[PDB]
Symmetry: D2
Subunit: 279 residues, 4 copies
């Protein structure tokens, strides 16, 4: 019966001794351990998976004063608990279908509390998987009201993460602030970047040899919130624009799944405007 | 078998390959490799064909190719595969690409004849000397940009080089110089996802927490670092890499990316296709 | 409206001229061309995707004397035709489920004429995809007869390919000969090779840093038939035997899918005991 | 910051990290890196910790580590990160791994001191000279296998090298030679999937139509080309690669694989774990 401790704090003497000292005090066998010290942000990170050899509740309570002393933000999760997630989607199926398959097959150990959309298109996909589907359409005069609707479902469902599986509506500053660091977005990426209409036609025109994607945390910042994962795939001159699009969508699937997996396995930490991701 | 390679590009139309293989069959040439690509968006057609004589009057073959090139409006060439293409390498104060190229050359991976190394600095004169290669230092001052280009462009012409490699040569070629070296000069630079402009891009990459570091090799044009892409390569990095460690990765990726591009050029596998390239494997 | 011509023959002068000359004679625009000449087996290979600008039927008819002249094995397939495939499975779901997903999502453009198994485990899965499922159990005294049962299904179904999605019964020499070069198998692979009991425990013990898989054509040879694809994934010392197993199964999925796609897109040719695979 | 790296392995038990960090805190050392791994199947525990002084009596730190090592039955070492490990490189007639290591060394990627290059052949004497490295040629005859090993084992001892790198050294080390170099010699060889035994393995790989070519770097034992694996790498190939082209790829992968193993060793990231290894990133 395992548990995973994660924590970050300002780097300071005695932090490791305090943490391992506690684990030892409560006779915890350490199944996994990973530590990282960022001398530039002056921040320390720990992920520890362990199990007892009554003891875990005592460890949790005694962790409080250590956390206060070092100003640590931390969490201890039951590894058997499946994090609750809400998946948002529009009219593009690929990321949603990919996540549901990885979930079906046991790769992503999470509880999908629901699938929410501005379109009705994937009601049957949600049904084929026994998952609740909520359709909240948007009109010109109801953008703030529609957001409140799905943000309400987010709160009442107990979800701790919102996965934007190619949800195509721009989130308001207030939505983004409210979901800051508890929502993961996915989009395509190019080297060099292409902005504006028909980016895959631009990428074809420029004859790029790589197509990519980036998964990041949603924040209420001027630019994209913190990067979690980036992946690229090699292409060549024989790829028409529609074939580049196909590669991009595939890379979005892998990229999103990696990000989501790292979040639900407690391997992703915020480090200012960037992330720490443990393998 | 003594091999030759025919490369050609021309406007899209029917019957080119038939005409080419017909001529080759008549000269009793065995086709070892044949790659064809039609780009229906740019309406351009590309062929690379490696062949050898089965029993070869190569001059008579070229002569008989003319009616074909004229009919189909082809740009073309037949090279002797044994010939080592002549190349001129430009460098400034950064050693890494120049050193990587010299290593691959010395070990026989890059089969080219380096007619000279040219630089705005004297730093790598000893490196050149150690490899038995001519080195020329042509310094630049605010006033002598045009004069200094004329100097190395002179070396380029008199040496017989058919390719100039900018191995992190950190001076911008004039529009005059780019035009004279059109389709005959390859540049390398670092590439980021997302892009970073201005000073200290590796520090920006670090602060942005990128998980990839890349590089792009391209043919040189007037549009600074943005000519036709030949090759792009990236390497995975993570949160533990400080700016100077990302810099080390970028320089490594520049090396591999440039070497790949130069190799495709000397193996006659890269063709211009407007603002992009066709690179056969 | 596209067609794909594939052919292999003993390498001889005039072979390209004959093929391109015929394509030009019938005003066929070439969408894709790939040729390869193997000077060691002295064998020539061509894959050509084209469309007419009545003409294709005449081309097919006139291809016969050229094929006879050069001793070519060849085929012209309608690209819109979905090759018919039969999938065999036992109690391991992973490859079958991966193929069904890729099929469902339109990546593998094939008609699955049926799923056949020695166990009943994946009947519900088959029903969920609207596919025919046949359970043919095996007992000590009926191994020859059970093979006949699914071989009959294979013949009557019109399938041109049998995909062994971790079908765990050894095929008889007669079955192997009958399915020669029309069936694809998948198995795990290691560097170095591990034979016998618990190969993932052996891989863990030896501390390998890579886990792989190989997809190959079934033949009636002593060793496995021609290799179509091999893939490896990196692992490390922290991977327990059960985690190595998980990576291996994942790689089997990717490897099989690549081989199957290459077969249904007419990109794989036999070249004696090896294969030519066009990208 | 002047860094040190502590490495240790010991039987699994509770309390080691606490004791280690406690000591480091007592000497006001800042922990820069800490990697821990317990292998519950071999019942071995491994730690690598990089640290530096903040306000360092290193010999008092070592002295105070003794009670900890004794109690927990640890094999351990504290190395100065600035120190360049001393290495001896063995080579025969194949240049590729030696040349690759020498380039990575010259360019600053492999921070080690090469105390010498030893060979059963004279071929690479000039390669050593050019890098200012001592070269020793120790030829072998039918009746002198034991005498010749004694010659280069003597160089190993007197040179103060802590690592022998077998850069395609093609003589089988004796059981005595292997024993003296236990945990201190790295070998490289090609690896295939499936495995090929005997003459002309690349021709065999070609005939089998393999789509990958690999290499394995390992510690040396009595067991020929078998020993604790440090690193494995593979490169994709296809039907168009002739046997000699497969060989060229295999040699390239041998270079990369060996270089990664050597770098892991000199960075103190590789631990023995019975018949396998632990390699921290």
């Amino acid at each position: 019966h395992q548990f995973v401790l994660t924590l970050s704090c300002p780097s300071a003497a005695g932090q490791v001794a305090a943490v391992v000292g506690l684990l030892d005090r409560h006779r915890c066998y350490v199944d996994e351990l990973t530590v990282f010290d960022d001398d530039l942000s002056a921040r320390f990170f720990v992920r520890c998976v362990f199990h007892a050899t009554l003891r875990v509740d005592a460890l949790r309570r005694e962790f409080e004063p250590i956390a206060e002393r070092f100003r640590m933000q931390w969490a201890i999760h039951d590894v058997a608990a499946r994090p609750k997630v809400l998946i948002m989607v529009s009219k593009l199926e690929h990321c949603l279908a990919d996540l549901l398959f990885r979930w079906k097959m046991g790769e992503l150990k999470m509880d999908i509390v629901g699938i929410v959309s501005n379109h009705p298109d994937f009601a049957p996909l949600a049904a084929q998987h026994g998952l609740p589907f909520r359709h909240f359409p948007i009109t010109a005069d109801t953008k703030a009201q529609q957001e409140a609707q799905w943000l309400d479902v987010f709160e009442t469902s107990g979800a701790e993460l919102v996965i934007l599986a190619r949800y195509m509506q721009v989130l308001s500053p207030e939505a983004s602030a409210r979901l800051a660091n508890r929502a993961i977005n996915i989009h395509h990426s190019f080297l060099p970047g292409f902005k504006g209409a028909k980016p895959y036609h631009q990428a074809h025109a420029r004859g790029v040899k790589l197509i990519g994607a980036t998964a990041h945390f949603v924040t209420d910042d001027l630019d994209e919130g913190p990067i979690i994962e980036q992946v690229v795939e090699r292409v060549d001159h024989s790829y028409r624009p529609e074939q580049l699009l196909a590669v991009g969508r595939d890379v979005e699937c892998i990229t999103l799944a990696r990000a989501v997996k790292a979040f639900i396995e407690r391997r992703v930490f915020l480090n200012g405007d960037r992330t720490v991701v443990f393998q």
